């Protein structure tokens, strides 16, 4: 598996069309893929935004030429119907041939519940997500009206008049070790977050391989892709402080209760311990450094990165990445 | 009122970038707006597409310069969540100030039931459209978080980071003289469809100012916004023949009923006679006779024109309008 340097342009951290400049200039540094969250509240409360991601990636996709963009990621199953999800990523991809995937995931309280006002439980919040793929592959491979009645969705004669010449590529996360199995048996690839090199390597690369292998496909053609922010500064304690913002996901209770206000996400992000912050995301005074952040990474499995620039100068810290992306092969 | 002349750029009857490159030579040409439909499921099933609207609306406002652009129109109440559809719009317009508008309207079984199942009377599915009309004005416009019970949507703490300089405008769709009312209390402006002029002026219109009145509004202020389709070739037979497409659409019942398989909305769009076609549609051999076309429409209160292009030479049917445009007026 080759690795992959992938740029995440946030919707929450930056404006939306901050993020789309920064797009731009990251395809001109050398980045293979561009990324962005699909968020309706933002994971901090101060300075903070949450664009719309399906609008902006229409225009992201327009205003660049070649690198490959996905959500990272989508949860297709409280605010968002699936077959939408399926419509929307089928259209983007038959608009820009092979330049567009998906990434889905069980969701974040902070999302779903301002709108929905409901917060199932997590193993719910995983069987929703299984229905709501088999929703989405039925939509993208039928040839024929399909009709469906799941535990949670409905189709009803529903057909995907545009469809792209080849499938949307489809992530799955999996941060915990079922939620990683689920990953190998329904996704074609892998997304994860907020874990330690040794977790990876332990827990979640092996579940995930484990049940890709149960489901009969081969984990060698599935990719390792993962979200992990940086930060790089001459200043290591100004880049380390930069981080904040992105602290609270790193509070494994986020993805799990029922919190939804930005302030009181803040509130968390805050008690974060700068070690936490340290050993998860990736802390650098310059390029030498970064390329060995990636390569604990790399060793532990990773293979497409999605690199959250969440440093002090945004400009200098995708330019450096000329420096880096050389070395870390691509 | 100053009359604006838009061009609704199907994505139901073209591929989306076929549908792009029309609005960006549509821009070129001189109209003052693009326009897009809105479906899950196509009017018409032989060689029909159904393309997600957002995200090709935010390819098109990255490609175009300055034209006004606004779906026509989005149901706000099934298949999709209204404070989604307001984070989209809110969305679009911040990145592109001034150019972006959106459309709303009860609905067509065709888009909401092949992903839900269900299908609501029209009494119980205008009430819920103004509803959603509600919660995408509170998130609009409000400087805190807001929390909302309705009896059909719910708002929880939910608050939009990402605002547009100034309020999305909002065009409300009302056919009959319950939904023409309704727009006139609630929407910024009318959008309607499939009516001849004489409907027009002495029911759609009167209709729609009582309700703007009855709500305390201006009514001068609020634009008569209308789709209809044309098609111009020197062949009349031919012009006629190629609106075909859109018979369905003079069918009354395709908007109440729960019909939503295409081919079966395709039958019944060709039983539509030709009379019914010529009568609503415009159908021309020349720039002089599209100039008459629309100056009936505008004698009877519409002043921003969207206009559908089922023309059989495509770019011909852009290009005239370089005739056309000036005669009317912008
Ligand atoms: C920027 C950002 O938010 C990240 C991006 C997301 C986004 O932009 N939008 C969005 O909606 N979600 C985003 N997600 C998160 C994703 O939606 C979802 O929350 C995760 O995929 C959930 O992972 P999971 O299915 O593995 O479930 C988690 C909660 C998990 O831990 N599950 C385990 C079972 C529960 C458990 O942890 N409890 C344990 C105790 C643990 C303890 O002691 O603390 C117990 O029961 O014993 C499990 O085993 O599965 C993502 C996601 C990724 O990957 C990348 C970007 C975004
Ligand atoms: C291309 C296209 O489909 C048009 C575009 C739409 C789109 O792209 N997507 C979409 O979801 N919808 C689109 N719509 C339609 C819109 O969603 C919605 O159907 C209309 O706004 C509904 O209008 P309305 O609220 O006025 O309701 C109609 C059905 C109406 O007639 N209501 C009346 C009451 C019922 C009635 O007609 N029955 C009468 C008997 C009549 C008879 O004898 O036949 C009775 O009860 O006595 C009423 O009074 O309100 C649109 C819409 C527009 O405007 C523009 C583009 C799209
Ligand atoms: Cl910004
Ligand atoms: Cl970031
Ligand atoms: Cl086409
Ligand atoms: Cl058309
Ligand atoms: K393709
Ligand atoms: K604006």
Same mark, same amino acid.
């Given at each position: 598996?080759?690795?992959?340097?992938?740029?995440?342009?946030?919707?929450?951290?930056? *404006?939306?069309?901050?993020?789309?400049?920064? @797009? &731009?200039?990251?395809?001109?540094?050398?980045?293979?893929?561009?990324?962005?969250?699909?968020?309706?509240?933002?994971?901090?409360?101060?300075?903070?935004?949450?664009?719309?991601?399906?609008?902006?990636?229409? @225009?992201?996709?327009? $205003?660049?030429?070649?690198?490959?963009?996905?959500?990272?990621?989508?949860?297709?199953?409280?605010?968002?119907?699936? @077959?939408?999800?399926?419509?929307?990523?089928?259209?983007? *991809?038959?608009?820009?041939?092979? *330049?567009?995937?998906?990434?889905?995931?069980?969701?974040?309280?902070?999302?779903?519940?301002?709108?929905?006002?409901?917060?199932?439980?997590?193993?719910?919040?995983?069987?929703?997500?299984? #229905?709501?793929?088999?929703?989405?592959?039925?939509?993208?491979?039928?040839?024929?009206?399909?009709?469906?009645?799941?535990?949670?969705?409905?189709?009803?004669?529903?057909?995907?008049?545009?469809?792209?010449?080849?499938?949307?590529?489809?992530?799955?996360?999996?941060?915990?070790?079922?939620?990683? +199995?689920?990953?190998?048996?329904?996704?074609?690839?892998?997304?994860?977050?907020? $874990? !330690?090199?040794?977790?990876?390597?332990?827990?979640? &690369?092996? =579940?995930?391989?484990?049940? $890709?292998?149960?489901?009969?496909?081969?984990?060698?053609?599935? #990719?390792?892709?993962?979200?992990?922010?940086?930060?790089?500064?001459?200043?290591?304690? +100004?880049?380390?402080? !930069?981080?904040?913002?992105?602290?609270?996901?790193?509070?494994?209770?986020?993805? =799990?209760?029922?919190?939804?206000?930005?302030?009181?996400?803040?509130?968390?992000?805050?008690?974060?311990?700068?070690?936490?912050?340290?050993?998860?995301?990736?802390?650098?005074?310059?390029?030498?450094?970064?390329?060995?952040?990636?390569?604990?990474?790399?060793?532990?499995? &990773?293979?497409?990165?999605?690199?959250?620039?969440?440093?002090?100068?945004?400009?200098?810290?995708?330019? &450096?990445?000329?420096?880096?992306?050389?070395?870390?092969?691509?």
């Amino acid at each position: 598996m080759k690795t992959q340097i992938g740029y995440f342009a946030s919707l929450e951290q930056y *404006r939306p069309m901050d993020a789309l400049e920064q @797009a &731009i200039r990251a395809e001109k540094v050398g980045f293979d893929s561009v990324w962005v969250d699909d968020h309706f509240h933002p994971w901090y409360h101060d300075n903070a935004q949450s664009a719309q991601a399906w609008a902006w990636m229409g @225009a992201a996709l327009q $205003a660049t030429k070649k690198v490959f963009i996905s959500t990272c990621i989508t949860c297709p199953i409280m605010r968002y119907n699936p @077959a939408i999800v399926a419509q929307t990523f089928a259209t983007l *991809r038959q608009m820009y041939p092979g *330049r567009v995937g998906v990434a889905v995931g069980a969701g974040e309280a902070m999302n779903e519940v301002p709108v929905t006002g409901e917060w199932p439980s997590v193993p719910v919040r995983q069987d929703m997500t299984v #229905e709501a793929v088999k929703v989405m592959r039925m939509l993208w491979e039928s040839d024929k009206p399909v009709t469906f009645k799941g535990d949670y969705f409905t189709l009803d004669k529903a057909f995907l008049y545009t469809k792209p010449d080849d499938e949307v590529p489809l992530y799955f996360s999996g941060m915990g070790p079922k939620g990683a +199995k689920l990953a190998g048996m329904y996704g074609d690839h892998l997304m994860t977050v907020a $874990a !330690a090199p040794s977790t990876l390597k332990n827990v979640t &690369i092996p =579940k995930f391989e484990e049940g $890709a292998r149960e489901a009969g496909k081969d984990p060698s053609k599935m #990719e390792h892709a993962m979200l992990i922010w940086y930060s790089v500064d001459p200043d290591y304690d +100004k880049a380390v402080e !930069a981080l904040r913002f992105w602290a609270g996901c790193l509070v494994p209770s986020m993805f =799990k209760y029922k919190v939804y206000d930005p302030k009181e996400v803040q509130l968390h992000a805050n008690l974060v311990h700068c070690d936490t912050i340290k050993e998860n995301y990736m802390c650098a005074t310059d390029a030498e450094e970064m390329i060995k952040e990636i390569e604990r990474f790399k060793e532990a499995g &990773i293979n497409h990165f999605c690199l959250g620039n969440s440093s002090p100068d945004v400009n200098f810290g995708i330019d &450096i990445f000329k420096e880096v992306i050389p070395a870390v092969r691509d």
